[PDB]
């Protein structure tokens, strides 16, 4: 069965919109789950003794919009009070209430599809024995799929995927590759090189396909405790070419960080 809402009801009986249907619609538009909120203090809450007065705060919890207009919440002294919005749809006249609790007791209850009381923490209010010392809001989470954006400003951090690979390149050379965002690679050299000539392909393992660059990458390395250096070429085909001077039977410790991009302009 298909239940339609944002459509013409010719007889004003067909597609009435329920509060839970708008709740789900709003949750979907903003990308919120039952474990977060949308919250805005239009005016600052006021702290008086062991109380927080929400002067004009709007909240969206489980896609349900409500306003706190001079609504006071009594607090526990010398405590971290977790302020919750509680939604009980069976309390038809007053479905929303606020509580100050000892822990974040957000329960993720699906009030739009099932029974139960939704509890969602939106504020953290710390008190002394006499009043409020600090207030910190709960993070408003946006769960999104694919974003097309022109410009972005990040005040915190972006967490991108990370892949690692250790290559025993041969001749005693070891590469430890870290790839981030599937593009930027930082190669850390380890081991000690011996029995190699300039221009020669190293005798060991070739770089795995996911770490291979589109174009040849020359990575500069250094010989530990010396004023001498080398470079290796990571070829698009996966092979590694030695471009330092010829090395004899005695291995010299190889170290250093080199970076490259896997992707070119495309």
């Amino acid at each position: 069965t298909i239940k339609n809402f944002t459509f013409f009801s010719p007889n004003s009986t067909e597609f009435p919109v329920g509060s839970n249907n708008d709740g789900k619609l709003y949750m979907m538009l903003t990308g919120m789950d039952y474990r977060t909120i949308r919250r805005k203090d239009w005016s600052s809450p006021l702290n008086t003794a062991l109380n927080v007065q929400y002067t004009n705060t709007s909240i969206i919890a489980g896609g349900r919009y409500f306003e706190l207009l001079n609504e006071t919440v009594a607090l526990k002294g010398d405590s971290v009070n977790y302020i919750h919005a509680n939604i009980d749809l069976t309390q038809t006249a007053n479905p929303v209430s606020l509580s100050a609790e000892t822990a974040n007791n957000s329960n993720g209850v699906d009030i739009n599809n099932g029974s139960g009381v939704l509890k969602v923490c939106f504020d953290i209010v710390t008190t002394s024995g006499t009043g409020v010392t600090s207030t910190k809001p709960i993070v408003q989470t946006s769960t999104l799929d694919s974003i097309s954006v022109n410009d972005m400003t990040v005040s915190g951090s972006i967490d991108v995927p990370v892949q690692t690979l250790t290559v025993e390149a041969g001749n005693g050379l070891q590469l430890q590759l870290t790839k981030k965002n599937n593009d930027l690679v930082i190669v850390r050299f380890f081991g000690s090189v011996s029995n190699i000539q300039k221009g020669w392909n190293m005798s060991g393992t070739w770089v795995d396909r996911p770490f291979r660059p589109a174009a040849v990458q020359s990575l500069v390395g250094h010989f530990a405790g010396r004023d001498t250096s080398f470079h290796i070429d990571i070829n698009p085909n996966g092979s590694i070419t030695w471009w330092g001077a010829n090395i004899d039977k005695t291995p010299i410790a190889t170290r250093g960080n080199g970076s490259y991009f896997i992707k070119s302009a495309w």
């Epitope: 070829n235 698009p236 030695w242 471009w243």
Partner: nanobody
Framework: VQLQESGGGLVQAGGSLRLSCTAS????????MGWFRQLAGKEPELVVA????????YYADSVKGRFTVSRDSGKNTVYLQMNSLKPEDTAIYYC????????????????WGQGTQVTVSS
């Protein structure tokens, strides 16, 4: 990855001869073009090679200062100018080409030729 093996035949000991090789395509970076030598039914071995991208040559100690490898424009053609020839040098010279620098291993070569026979008369 096809190969052409122009030049090669009969000449006297202490004389001079040449070898030509052209590859259809290049498999990637660190493009090395050269020749593998096979004397008296023994195992084939790389003797002369040129790193195209680096303009760096490799010659085995046994042929040093006697042989000279050259490149023709951007035609991906390699020439071996063999002067002061020896009877030991009588071998079957196959043309080898690869991406990834110089290597002793046969399998690592993307292009392998038919093989032109060198006969140094006495």
């Amino acid at each position: 990855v096809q190969l052409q093996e122009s030049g090669g035949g009969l000449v006297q000991a202490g004389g001079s001869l040449r070898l030509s090789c052209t590859a259809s395509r290049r498999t990637g970076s660190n493009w090395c073009m050269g020749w593998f030598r096979q004397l008296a039914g023994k195992e084939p071995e790389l003797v002369v090679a040129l790193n195209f991208d680096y303009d760096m040559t490799y010659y085995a100690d046994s042929v040093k200062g006697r042989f000279t490898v050259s490149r023709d424009s951007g035609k991906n053609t390699v020439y071996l100018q063999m002067n002061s020839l020896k009877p030991e040098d009588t071998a079957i010279y196959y043309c080898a080409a690869r991406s990834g620098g110089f290597s002793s291993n046969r399998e690592l070569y993307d292009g392998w030729g038919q093989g032109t026979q060198v006969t140094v008369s006495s």
